[PDB]
Amino acid sequence: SMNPPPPETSNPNKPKRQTNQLQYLLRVVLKTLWKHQFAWPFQQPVDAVKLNLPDYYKIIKTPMDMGTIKKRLENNYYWNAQECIQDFNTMFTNCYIYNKPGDDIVLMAEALEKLFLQKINELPT
Ligand SMILES: Cc1nnc2ccc(-c3cc(O[C@H](C)[C@H]4CNC(=O)C4)c4cccnc4c3)cn12
Numbered sequence: 171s172m173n174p175p176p177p178e179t180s181n182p183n184k185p186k187r188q189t190n191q192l193q194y195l196l197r198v199v200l201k202t203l204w205k206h207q208f209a210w211p212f213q214q215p216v217d218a219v220k221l222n223l224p225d226y227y228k229i230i231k232t233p234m235d236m237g238t239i240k241k242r243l244e245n246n247y248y249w250n251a252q253e254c255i256q257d258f259n260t261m262f263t264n265c266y267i268y269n270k271p272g273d274d275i276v277l278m279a280e281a282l283e284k285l286f287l288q289k290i291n292e293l294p295t
Contacts, residue, residue: 212235230264
């Protein structure tokens with residue numbers, strides 16, 4: 171029981187575009203969360219073996235992390251801003267599913283999610 175391959179970060183059959191919303195997602199949303207004191211546990215895929223998380227990939231079938239989101243934004247993988255927002259939502263939700271209220275990682279995820287919500291509220295129209 172080890173880790174799956176990380177999520178894809180490049181799709182060569184998918185066209186690429188730069189938009190004002192995608193710029194905001196990289197330059198404000200991802201950058202702010204990535205640089206936060208609590209970001210390190212979320213900067214790469216969950217390594218259930220190194221972290222001793224039994225049954226992680228029996229419980230979480232749609233893993234996501236900020237390292238994947240950063241690479242997707244840097245590679246212009248996202249065509250729609252909603253794809254990126256959905257990945258951040260999946261990352262936080264998985265943490266809440268696997269862990270318990272009051273756990274250190276959940277309190278860290280909640281602080282990052284509050285900051286995510288504050289920044290996404292100012293996504294340009
Ligand atoms: C995402 C996601 N979803 N569930 C989990 C469950 C655990 C983790 C996790 C926790 C970590 O540290 C703990 C908060 C303390 C124990 N050791 C310390 O140094 C502090 C990590 C420290 C360095 C790198 N990666 C970590 C990943 C992330 N998780």
